[PDB]
Design a protein around this ligand. Sequence first.
Ligand SMILES: O=C(O)Cc1cs/c(=N\C(=O)CS(=O)(=O)Cc2ccc3ccccc3c2)n1O
Ligand SMILES: O=C(O)Cc1cs/c(=N\C(=O)CS(=O)(=O)Cc2ccc3ccccc3c2)n1O
Ligand SMILES: [Zn+2]
Ligand SMILES: [Zn+2]
Lengths: 338, 338
Amino acid sequence: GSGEPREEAGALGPAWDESQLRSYSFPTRPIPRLSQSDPRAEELIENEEPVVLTDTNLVYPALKWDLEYLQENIGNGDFSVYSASTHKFLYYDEKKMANFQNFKPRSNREEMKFHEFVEKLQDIQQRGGEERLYLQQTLNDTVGRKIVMDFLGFNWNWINKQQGKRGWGQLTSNLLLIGMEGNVTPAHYDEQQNFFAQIKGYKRCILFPPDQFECLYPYPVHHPCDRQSQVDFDNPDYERFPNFQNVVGYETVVGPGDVLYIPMYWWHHIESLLNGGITITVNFWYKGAPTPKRIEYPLKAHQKVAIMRNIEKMLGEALGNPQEVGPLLNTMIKGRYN
Amino acid sequence: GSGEPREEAGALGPAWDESQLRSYSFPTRPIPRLSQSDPRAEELIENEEPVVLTDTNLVYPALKWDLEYLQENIGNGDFSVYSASTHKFLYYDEKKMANFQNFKPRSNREEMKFHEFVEKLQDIQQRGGEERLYLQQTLNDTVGRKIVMDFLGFNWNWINKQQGKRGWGQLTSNLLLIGMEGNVTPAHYDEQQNFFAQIKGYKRCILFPPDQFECLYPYPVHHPCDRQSQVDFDNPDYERFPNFQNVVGYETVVGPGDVLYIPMYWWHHIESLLNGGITITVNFWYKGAPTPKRIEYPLKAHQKVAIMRNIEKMLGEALGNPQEVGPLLNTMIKGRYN
Ligand SMILES: O=C(O)Cc1cs/c(=N\C(=O)CS(=O)(=O)Cc2ccc3ccccc3c2)n1O
Ligand SMILES: O=C(O)Cc1cs/c(=N\C(=O)CS(=O)(=O)Cc2ccc3ccccc3c2)n1O
Ligand SMILES: [Zn+2]
Ligand SMILES: [Zn+2]
């Protein structure tokens, strides 16, 4: 798993204990925790494998952040706040909701000012209700001057060197994440390189390499939950998803000051620790390096995932209806390739 | 089936009787036999449905053909002669034999002069052996002057009008077919429009429309038997090919002077009648009409077959190995589209 819980400086006790981790059916092994000066960390990022960097100082000015400080300085912009009846915040593409009419969302999005989100959070704690909120908002110009000064204080020297040494594309987005304890972002994979900068609280990160595509059963590309696993990690249906019994993850717990490299196309299941308070995270997303001119074989697992995605996209446009993608694929292989 | 056997002119008896037809497990209904002046025959060809035209005079000068006449006038060119231990002449692409090493051919091709094929045929009848031969050769310049005169005597006025009225491409090939009684060309589909001009003997033609792709289970596109059905019509494996229990064919018996329009992508199973002597056929293959600019929906069945073919071709080149096409397709749909 995450190994033994780390001891905090000043003898302040264990940062967490195992009772704050949710229980699942699959084994894991630890993601390495290394210094940014460690060459092994450099070779992991280069080979697109996850690593937790403990001393980047990437978001050092943001480590003082909390709700009180942010509400006063984050400005009067709008923030996307997702609500959920349960602890699972399954994301859904609103653009693709037209393809699947028999899909009703379980986590409705709502725009609100930051002071409204802080107010709405404190009502749930007062009322003792079980409703959960998760702020997920991209940062921009509307933020106040002090947040701008903190942002400029980020270790741009280090992360821009990482961008150059890997040949990545440009920085596409900065996502601010503020979640309640026990909030779970279920397993999914992204298409860009991610630097996961933990700020407040602790998050358990369970990653799965791209070659376990067969064990995680993502939704159809045209489904609103595209790129997310169909498997309910809390109650896996081994009849529908038999190879989930073969899944093995990479696990770590990140805390304030840690940066987790989530490589492009790697599955990740992220949860804020139980009874751990609020969590704050800022992501750095970079387009991957361009596909090289001389195609080398055998193909990497994420390249085959890209191929499978393009086949499904091409079929949807070719047939004139994404719902015919399924039956044509079955017609193509039944009694011919299985 | 083929309906009642036709009575020949001059009270020469029935052209054939049902005992000369092989028995299969599927029902059929008759392909229409019409005059070329019948508008219904014109609308069948236009809508790409099979029809037997009884009075085209397409190969009228060739109706006098037999082994003796051809051997004397066909010239000293080489002829492709396929041999088979059984009555099934399953064709195999020699170019694709590299992809599947565990494939050994059952019908070896051999080049020989026409007088050698006639000699080799008469030895089998003398020795009483059960070996079977099937001459399948494209016609060209090397043929003698009298065969040239017969060829020029074909009803080019009619068939070139059909080429124009359908917007077909150019005439790509003329295949001369000389087979022994009981010879079976198992079920397969071609990609071009075919005018099937019967000359000597009788052939039972069983056709299946493109929308029965699911019932006929063709080989993988990269397999040497690409475009041929995997189902043994003589012993169908309902466990591997369950939807073959749903197959329904279009059936007719063509004789001297009949022309069968086999539409592009239609499956066809062709057999020379049992105890019917030798059969002679000449095919006319035309590239189909170009795909129209404004794509209309829903797609025709043969267009979806074209899509499935291109997906398999694209995967073979993308993965660098046609043998990885299967497992990737299974990975793509297992637990996601089935
Ligand atoms: O709670 C947690 O900490 C876990 C968690 C909460 S959100 C989340 N990821 C996303 O939101 C990203 S994505 O899924 O929309 C897909 C995507 C991928 C690259 C992009 C790059 C730029 C802009 C947008 C992008 C979007 N993770 O991993
Ligand atoms: O015994 C019988 O009468 C039944 C029978 C014996 S042969 C046969 N068909 C073929 O040979 C053709 S094909 O399979 O190679 C595929 C193809 C398709 C279009 C073409 C056009 C031009 C040149 C070559 C072509 C090749 N049929 O239907
Ligand atoms: Zn993500
Ligand atoms: Zn054919």
